[PDB]
């Protein structure tokens, strides 16, 4: 289920009330997160659970949850690179209902998108190195994209 803030504590625990708030009622067994919990680490733990509990049938869950896991591991270690949060947002967009074979991956991407929406400053703090996907090959001048 999507994370909610302190201001959402006043609405009733019904299906449509939580659904209009941007989350799901789910099992209605709520979990509180205090200020001492890093949201990047928490969402990393959640996505490690969800990626390792993929059944492996369909491509977006099976091959997109581990990418989000690796991005969150890099963000937790301070080795994030530009485009990582954009990749996470696109993963939340493309793992929604109907895109995957079952509802496991939409539930996987609900906390990630909610935490990026509400606690973006913790995710941007993990980006500390420039983007580098290629090493230099001696004798070949790279195509310097702008």
């Amino acid at each position: 289920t999507d994370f909610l803030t302190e201001a959402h504590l006043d609405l009733p625990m019904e299906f449509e009330s939580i659904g209009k708030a941007g989350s799901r009622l789910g099992t209605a067994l709520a979990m509180a997160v205090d200020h001492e919990i890093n949201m990047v680490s928490l969402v990393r733990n959640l996505e490690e659970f969800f990626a390792r509990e993929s059944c492996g049938w369909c491509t977006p869950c099976r091959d997109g949850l581990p990418w989000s896991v690796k991005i969150l591991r890099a963000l937790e270690r301070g080795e994030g690179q530009p485009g990582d949060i954009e990749t996470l947002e696109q993963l939340c967009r493309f793992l929604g209902p109907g895109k995957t074979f079952c509802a496991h991956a939409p539930g996987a991407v609900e906390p990630l998108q909610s935490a990026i929406k509400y606690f973006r400053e913790e995710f941007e703090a993990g980006i500390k190195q420039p983007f580098s996907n290629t090493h230099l090959i001696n004798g070949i001048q790279p195509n310097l994209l702008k």
């Binding site: 290629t134 195509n143 702008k146």
Partner: protein
Amino acid sequence: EPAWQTRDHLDDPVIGELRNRFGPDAFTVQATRTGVPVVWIKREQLLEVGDFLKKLPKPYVMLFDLHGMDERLRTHREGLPAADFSVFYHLISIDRNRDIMLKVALAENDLHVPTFTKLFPNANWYERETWDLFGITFDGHPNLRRIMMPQTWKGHPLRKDYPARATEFSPFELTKAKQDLEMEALTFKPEEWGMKRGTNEDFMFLNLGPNHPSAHGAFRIVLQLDGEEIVDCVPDIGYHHRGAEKMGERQSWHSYIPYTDRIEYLGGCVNEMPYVLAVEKLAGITVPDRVNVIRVMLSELFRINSHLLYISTFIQDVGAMTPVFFAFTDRQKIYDLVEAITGFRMHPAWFRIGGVAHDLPRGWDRLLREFLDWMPKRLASYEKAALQNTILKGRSQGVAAYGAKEALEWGTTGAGLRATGIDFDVRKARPYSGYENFDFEIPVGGGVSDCYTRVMLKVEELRQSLRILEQCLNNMPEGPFKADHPLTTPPPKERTLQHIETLITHFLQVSWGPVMPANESFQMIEATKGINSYYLTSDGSTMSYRTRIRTPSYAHLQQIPAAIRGSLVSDLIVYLGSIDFVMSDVDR
């Protein structure tokens, strides 16, 4: 809307004028990526449509191109009239700065079209080539004979059912053609070449070929002379036919680039530019600005190379032999820079679909600075030593002169057309490859296209190309040398060497070929010798369905008899030296 987008050009005023004159059901407008309106006309209305276009308030004055197409194997013909064959007519209105492409559909058995030669006289050679390579008869043609192939040739090579490859060599056919060559001098019939009055008992018949000791190539002209006066002259061309268009139907979009190099073999990257621009239109690729500047600099370097060769060859044809030595030293400086950048001298094959093959090497600017400091003193010395000599002026001034009307009616482009006073350069009228970002002038003549006027116009064009090179040197963007399009062929090499997606794209692009979606594209450029254009038809495959190359040397060689009649033979040699043609450009 991008510049490569498919357009029907229904907002062109010529479409409305044709609607008003002939009705809305008389023709079919085809949406292409050629950039010009393409109109499918019925065969029985072709002469009326052509005369109407010729009589417009700002008329279509030049038949730019005329050729054929075998449509029998074209699978994607949506929105097109039923056609086994077709004939296209590319017409240019200079005053409107607009073009139109008329297309006539033909059935397989009814392969005849009315001739266009009463409206445009360059349709003579264009229709002879269409008959030669496609078997399309033009009714009313004065002499519809083969122009590329020999007269005793069987079949039509540009038909889709004609095999492209070389047949098995036989010395018996070679000896038969040798006997034909040695008997033609004894059994010459001056009626089969379009000539008249075959010996007044004073007309001496001479031959200039079929071997010429010059760089423009080897070709034959049959001269009818009264004393020293040329009263009739018919050319024999096709002696350097390489089947380049048929080869365009045989190579992939990427592997055809070295063939584009050898069309006008003094042009190089200039020859490559219209082909890669037309392919990028087919691919929907917009190249970055650094690609534009790199391609402009390479084309201007090769334009200076070609112009130095042309000026030195003209001076040698006049009779002074030392400026060709010095101009080849300057050509060696240009070749030093081109060798440094592309790794080759004459046929670099360095342009790519979506960019260039490599980035610029470190230290290219020093070589460009050395050439730019070396050139102007040498050019001034060339002028003072040979171009201001009164013997050269007496050999050149007033020789083979024509005006604007004769240049327009024969499809003359380049320095001859601008020497007639018509200010039409492709780099300004229809800009391409980022030429609008450069400050340069277009030299024009006073109204008479002389040998001397054409040579001096080429000298000023050399100076303007030096100006463009100086601006290229001072202003270089620090960007990519290849576009980020998926159809950029090949992809950047380092990503190919370490990324699997890029490796897959490279693998399929170099092996099966890049897939161009089914469309038609066109690109004309200001080449070293005039306007060079590529007209490409993709049927959705990895090779061209039809590659049509319009070269200016064909039109200039066809204009030769209209401008040299009544002159001396030495004037004909000077005119041949002043045209700036090559036979590979003529025959392709």
